[PDB]
Subunit: 258 residues, 4 copies
Amino acid sequence: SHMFTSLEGRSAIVTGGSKGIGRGIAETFANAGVDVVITGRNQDDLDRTVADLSGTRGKVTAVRADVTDPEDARRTVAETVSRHGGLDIVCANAGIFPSGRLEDLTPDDIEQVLGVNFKGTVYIVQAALQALTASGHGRVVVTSSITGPITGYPGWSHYGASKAAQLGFLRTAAMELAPKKITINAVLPGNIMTEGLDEMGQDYLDQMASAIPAGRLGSVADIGNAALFFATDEAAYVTGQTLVVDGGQVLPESHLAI
Amino acid sequence: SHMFTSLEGRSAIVTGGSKGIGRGIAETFANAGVDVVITGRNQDDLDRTVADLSGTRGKVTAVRADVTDPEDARRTVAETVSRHGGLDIVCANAGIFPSGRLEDLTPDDIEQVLGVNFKGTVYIVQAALQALTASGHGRVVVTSSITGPITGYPGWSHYGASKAAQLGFLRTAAMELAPKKITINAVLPGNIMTEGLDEMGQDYLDQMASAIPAGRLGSVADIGNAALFFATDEAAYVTGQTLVVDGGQVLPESHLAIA
Amino acid sequence: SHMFTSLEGRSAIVTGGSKGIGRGIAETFANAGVDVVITGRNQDDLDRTVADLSGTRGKVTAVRADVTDPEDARRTVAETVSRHGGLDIVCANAGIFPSGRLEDLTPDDIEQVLGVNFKGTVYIVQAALQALTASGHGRVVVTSSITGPITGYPGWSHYGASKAAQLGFLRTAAMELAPKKITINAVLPGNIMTEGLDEMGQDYLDQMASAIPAGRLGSVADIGNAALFFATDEAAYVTGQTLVVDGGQVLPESHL
Amino acid sequence: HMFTSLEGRSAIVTGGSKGIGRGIAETFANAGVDVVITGRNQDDLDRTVADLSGTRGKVTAVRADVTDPEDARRTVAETVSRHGGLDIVCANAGIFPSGRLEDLTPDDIEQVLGVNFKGTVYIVQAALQALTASGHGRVVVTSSITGPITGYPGWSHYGASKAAQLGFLRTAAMELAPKKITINAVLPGNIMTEGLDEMGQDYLDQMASAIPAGRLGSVADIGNAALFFATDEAAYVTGQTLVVDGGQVLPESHL
Ligand SMILES: NC(=O)c1ccc[n+]([C@@H]2O[C@H](COP(=O)([O-])OP(=O)(O)OC[C@H]3O[C@@H](n4cnc5c(N)ncnc54)[C@H](OP(=O)(O)O)[C@@H]3O)[C@@H](O)[C@H]2O)c1
Ligand SMILES: NC(=O)c1ccc[n+]([C@@H]2O[C@H](COP(=O)([O-])OP(=O)(O)OC[C@H]3O[C@@H](n4cnc5c(N)ncnc54)[C@H](OP(=O)(O)O)[C@@H]3O)[C@@H](O)[C@H]2O)c1
Ligand SMILES: NC(=O)c1ccc[n+]([C@@H]2O[C@H](COP(=O)([O-])OP(=O)(O)OC[C@H]3O[C@@H](n4cnc5c(N)ncnc54)[C@H](OP(=O)(O)O)[C@@H]3O)[C@@H](O)[C@H]2O)c1
Ligand SMILES: NC(=O)c1ccc[n+]([C@@H]2O[C@H](COP(=O)([O-])OP(=O)(O)OC[C@H]3O[C@@H](n4cnc5c(N)ncnc54)[C@H](OP(=O)(O)O)[C@@H]3O)[C@@H](O)[C@H]2O)c1
Ligand SMILES: [Cl-]
Ligand SMILES: [Cl-]
Ligand SMILES: [Cl-]
Ligand SMILES: [Cl-]
Ligand SMILES: [Cl-]
Ligand SMILES: [Mg+2]
Ligand SMILES: [Mg+2]
């Protein structure tokens, strides 16, 4: 009869919500009656996802914005407050994972990944702070990864760096946000079927599939539903923490051990 | 419209559900339409909680049983499988946290705590394996603690050991249970208002409250709602993992971090 | 021309010192001039290891003792203090890793593993508290494992629990021991070429090998040298902590 | 015989003119390791080079900014010229300015990320060929408990930068293993240093009571941990962390 208090009518931002995990998070929240502003740089991709999600209970709309731009963060929050009247949930999700061996990585390569993945998470949280404070039950959910905080994978030394940087930030942010009644937590997916992971190629997807006790790559709904849990009133006592959503992938001591 | 898939009508066991966190877990699942068998050693305590929860949607009944005894674990599962028609969720929750300095801990002190807190988790999971497998969506939630896996506290070196033992066990158990479609995860509460935590005294409670950025001890519902998430179909891809429910307690570097 | 302060003359116990990692810890400390008492249940294995190490700078001798028996812990400490005049280092190392699936493990199976691997670590620490306190620079090094604290491996759910139990114990113990100037820390070996690990077969041994970035199983000296570092005076500010010694094995997002 | 002598080997210590980097430099020098220390302030580099003039291994200085890849390349070339090669890199330079979340500007974040994380990556990249040629390369990163483990108001960007170093090295260790280079990190708790003294006596008098060991750490505690990682005997340790903090991260309640 009753599980979690309904989030209907609340207001959320998902950065990088046009594709992949961000889209699955937006759809998960929208199905729960949360109005969602999704962001991204490509307008056509935002428009297709807004069109695709037009039948959801919560209204998904788009704001074209680069997470690396602090001005775009402020505009995103202001536009979301304008459309919804306030702001309750920020899902700091936008992220990229280009691959490059450490000896090949340029300053620009490193700043590209750290700017989107880490700086872009900090910028949207900063911009959203006052509206989340006015919420009285603010929720920030960060899309980190097992890569960095837990795992290594050749080619992703800067990616993993940026995923760990998110968590180092939120362990302090959680303490600064607690008097404002905002929780901040992070989902750490393992390997989820997305357009972004598709670019890694089939042999990467097979490789990770065989390393996962659950026997499959995860789904965007898996991450959206973890985000949803963190946003509930029922999770008000959870802050500064991580949840690994990976089918057991970080557990095995070795390969065939699965 | 829709948040998670209703768990209405599923079957659960909560060990040590007559008091404290286990009762909060039982009530949380009961309010979700889950039928719950709570266990414990004191029949009066079980009867009173069953009566306290008489008005919940799901049906909360009791089974008097000692987690340290594997035969009781088998009896608990069978009674549950007869009353509910199956078994979908096992909350390995029963535990004790008496306090003793390392130089005072007897073999009995250590075995009492390891047996209740760790052996009693293993035995209930072993007893439930077959019914959980037949459910096709089996869920095990372990009540661990920040104490042991993360923190230390003088007098709890055997308690901390048992809480971390639960986690070492489940990181392998999650792999063995994956082909059976059973996930196993732990909630790691920080400090939660319970009858057991009351026996630590007012100085302990004041000390811990001031250590918590959220500014309060947690409630039993906080832990119940975390166990509820793990038990959802929507958490099928989460196994072998932990969730710390502590108001931020384990974060501060020191006491101006807080102050 | 100076790295760490010589441990020459100090007094150590290594539980389970006749074979495998314990013997490597014992030899590493003896090479550093530490007098070492090794323990084990089999007198022949103790006698043979004492004879093998009879040329080391530190004197290695043996006490036949079961780590699961608290009286044997006490007798071990008393005998070491009688032989050396004190006790500075305790290497709580003794352990077993039989395998069994979750649904096959009997109460006696579980207790055997928890008894040796966890209780035996607690009992030697307890028995040594007094003498370690009197040393003024006491050191406890626990041989834990990546299995349990970090990894899972089917058939070792009770092994993994026992190894993680060591760490939960030591995080509190480090706080109770700090006023006594005793530090307590753990080495978490990955996969180390030993007698006990050879009881897993060549299939298990080749399996972990390709899963390790360093390209090899570790050596008992790798673990002994970690323990040696924790025992230095220079590590007096390290306590309640862990060091994974595994050639990178816990790192890969997949071992392919 | 404790560990194999490192006498005659070659090391870089970034930010080695003060505090922890100076303790690392003096610890390696006392072991007979020739050490190039970097920094931006020549006056502080000259003063430290002179203070350590009696050490067995020779401490010399190269003025360089960790945030500049070209300064990283120059540091490694100058070091290979002076010593004949390079065996050990201690990526240690770091800053910890304090600022509340809502006040951190983009420049504040880039300054801390640039020094603490980018500066670690750049000196490792620059050293890769020389470290590979040594056949026993050693990278030691100075991270922190702050970020990887703890939070402290005002240090959200600093903690991010210290956790960034570890996410980097967990992958870097796998890429470096075929080159026979290990890479680990020391995570100091609270260590008596010059930069740490900028936090004031209130911050000083207050982290001491929360540490089970009962004191702040010393730069030698960090140097000796870095020395362990650099030994031949630690060849099978890579991608890993060592917390040096007197038990500070352990207490459930610091009171
Ligand atoms: N897929 C996995 O297995 C996995 C696992 C662990 C963690 N993650 C994390 O999940 C997050 C998204 O992963 P994904 O697989 O879903 O990626 P994806 O499928 O490639 O989608 C990324 C989204 O982020 C947006 N984006 C990219 N750069 C942006 C920028 N500078 N500003 C604003 N938006 C930007 C993209 O829109 P535009 O390109 O049009 O801007 C797109 O909507 C990342 O943080 C990633 O690290 C993914
Ligand atoms: N309260 C906290 O802050 C906190 C924090 C972290 C973790 N935890 C964990 O949460 C669990 C319960 O904590 P709590 O505060 O709720 O304790 P509690 O209030 O004392 O409740 C303990 C429950 O377990 C039962 N129990 C005790 N021994 C048992 C046994 N041998 N067999 C079966 N049932 C037994 C008790 O009933 P009977 O005595 O009648 O049998 C009681 O119902 C423990 O595992 C504890 O480690 C608690
Ligand atoms: N080998 C690995 O890859 C690995 C990896 C991680 C951790 N570890 C840990 O390292 C420790 C030992 O490993 P190992 O490979 O060296 O094992 P091993 O080769 O089988 O030797 C174990 C030693 O402990 C002794 N022992 C066993 N049971 C005892 C008891 N009840 N009382 C006293 N001594 C006892 C044995 O002598 P007796 O039988 O005669 O008593 C033997 O000397 C264990 O704690 C293990 O968990 C090993
Ligand atoms: N002190 C602690 O309690 C503590 C705890 C955990 C971790 N750590 C870490 O240990 C490292 C050193 O800390 P510390 O307390 O020893 O700081 P410190 O006493 O202030 O010394 C910092 C050193 O880094 C150098 N440096 C600063 N900015 C630089 C730049 N842009 N390029 C090159 N060198 C630069 C400084 O020289 P110049 O100014 O001349 O450049 C100085 O030699 C840091 O990475 C810190 O995060 C410290
Ligand atoms: Cl992290
Ligand atoms: Cl654990
Ligand atoms: Cl652990
Ligand atoms: Cl096994
Ligand atoms: Cl990290
Ligand atoms: Mg795109
Ligand atoms: Mg001698």
